[PDB]
């Protein structure tokens, strides 16, 4: 998998999520916020905070809070906040993210 | 466990390993290299504002995680961020699972617990 | 003052800058936003951060419908952050459709059809 | 034909001319100017003291030189630059002056009535 | 003595200490910390030029002249000087910077300021 | 919080910052204006290559009379735009008068005479 990515959807839009256990906080790029029509949901705090958005990871939907930044390092960084909030396993034997009992396979990058 | 740490040993020396799925490459600080007496063990090596370039590479050091021993290669840096950064290279090389349900690193079939906030600053 | 053509991409009117010196066709991110093509992209990118200029690839549109004259053309192009020009019609597409830049008649001859180059009023 | 090139001769010297409809002005490199013995033909007309950061701007202008494209000869005005990126850039100025057609069907430049073929990758360096 | 330097020792290692009454705080270069093997002693306290703060040495043994002194200092990545002897330590040991005799008088003992040869 | 002394330059009371780490003595332009020394100056400066502070040199006062305690001293210094301190008493003058910065007694001993370092209240 070379670096760890997952397919997720935010507000219905397909997104490649970078799985980083070393990041305290989940971020989405401003450009990704623009692509997902989430700009209308923003804060006055770093571009702003999304207080709640719908994530579709596998077959299940998750309520999520994250920060929007101007940096396009990745479109979406799935950080330790969300990793632990949904009690995930980063399984590099099976190459999957196991969230609830469900396994989401690691990715489709260039 | 506000960040993921594990207790491991390199060449017999107890170390706190920072577990980072977002790092392509495993690094150890020069100070930790000094504490593990691995300075004499080095290699040559990055072309021509950060990441602190390189001191050298350790071709092999033996890691003890749980009751099992692992061969490792990593880079030594002057960067003091953490004593040892357990990156995606080693995470996948030993086919680890970062289990945040049970709060353990499952390496072979064995489970190594993530350290409490007390064990860290 | 340079060569422009009126085209449409996914139904949106565009002024295309005709450049035989460019290996690749590009559209600005702002034009990509105007044409609602942000969700239409790839993982196309420019390595890790060496070269000192322009800006770099935002992503690639694998296929989009171009309307030039009366005829419709399938196209691929890259999106960039630089707004220098909204759309650069490059040598990739110039040769893909075997276009002729006719500066005698001042037309782009795509197939047998001729598209006139724009007058300075049709440009700002 | 990884880009569009033509064989031309300027002041008798064989050159590979890069055909660019997106350049407002025809340019020759200083090195090409020296190899074509055009240096004794130069002017003081230049790019001032307000500058950019990269393009090594203007050495001077050649008010007229003979181009041989195919069997015909053409009078030409162009600018010399220090940038050796390409030897000679045949720009929109000259493209329109001789009412050229860039034919990518036949892979030729049609300039007065004659057709001049675009160069193969062999005729161009590594 | 184109600036004021003193010979001192930290954890046994000879160092050239730059005497600065204008610096609130004593600092050592990371390079000097490495050469003195004080790396295993670092708190790793930071701040939220001279590449800012690496970490703090809460206590290290300084030999100035024939006496030994307990010292606290910060380590920085800046190589400006190997060791900056600041006002903190200057006053803590009630030193006199004597430019008549060209000495640092720490206790009753006098440590001579170094000749330009002993420096670049 | 630091070492200050009361001095006079050309008759004007000044708070002098004592810095053994500074090679050269400097005075701010505002202090030069307060000491009526602006018309008395030279064309001294530091070239073309620099850093991102110190505000560079305005010029040199070749001689000004310093009163430290009961005794009077000839001095040279540079004027800067920087208001870091009004007057920085550097190693040049520290050694020129063979001063002792005595932190046991908290005094500057310039000859046999001792000038006390200022209390935090005497600083603003």
Numbering used by the authors:
A (entry chain E): 296 to 340, 353 to 414, 418 to 420
B (entry chain F): 296 to 340, 342 to 344, 348 to 420
C (entry chain D), F (entry chain A): 297 to 420
D (entry chain C): 296 to 421
E (entry chain B): 296 to 343, 349 to 420
What does the paper say about this structure?
Ddi1 is a multidomain protein that belongs to the ubiquitin receptor family of proteins. The Ddi1 proteins contain a highly conserved retroviral protease (RVP)-like domain along with other domains. The crystal structures of the RVP domains of Ddi1 from T. gondii and C. hominis were determined; they form homodimers similar to those observed in HIV protease and the reported structures of the same domain from Saccharomyces cerevisiae, Leishmania major and humans. The ubiquitin receptor family of proteins bind to ubiquitinated substrates through the UBA domain and deliver the substrates to the proteasome by interacting with the regulatory subunit of the 26S proteasome through the UBL domain.
The solution had six dimers in the asymmetric unit (ASU) with TFZ and LLG of 35 and 3173, respectively, in the space group P41212. Out of the six dimers in the ASU, the flap regions of both the subunits in only one dimer and the flaps of three other subunits in different dimers had electron density. In the ToxoDdi1-RVP structure, a hydrophobic binding cavity is formed by the side chains of residues Met398, Ph305, Phe313, Ala318, Phe322, Ile353, Thr374, Leu376, Val381 and Leu384. The binding cavity in the ToxoDdi1-RVP structure has a width of ∼27 ​Å (distance between the Cα atoms of Asn379 residues of the two subunits of the dimer), while in the CrypDdi1-RVP structure, the cavity width is ∼22.5 ​Å (distance between the Cα atoms of Ser284 of the two subunits). The cavity in ToxoDdi1-RVP is larger than that formed in HIV protease which has a width of ∼19–22 ​Å in the open form, while the size of the cavity in CrypDdi1-RVP is comparable to that of HIV protease. The flap of ToxoDdi1-RVP forms a loop without the characteristic β-hairpin structure. The distance between the Cα atoms of Val348 residues located at the tips of the two flaps is 11.5 ​Å. The distance between the Cα atom of Val348 and the Cα atom of Asp315 (catalytic aspartate) is 21.6 ​Å in one subunit and 21.2 ​Å in the other. The MD simulations showed that RMSD values of the flaps of subunits A and B stabilized at about 5.5 and 6.5 ​Å, respectively. Of all the inhibitors tested, nelfinavir showed binding to ToxoDdi1-RVP with a Kd of 237.6 ​± ​6.3 ​μM and saquinavir showed binding to CrypDdi1-RVP with a Kd of 242.1 ​± ​3 ​μM.
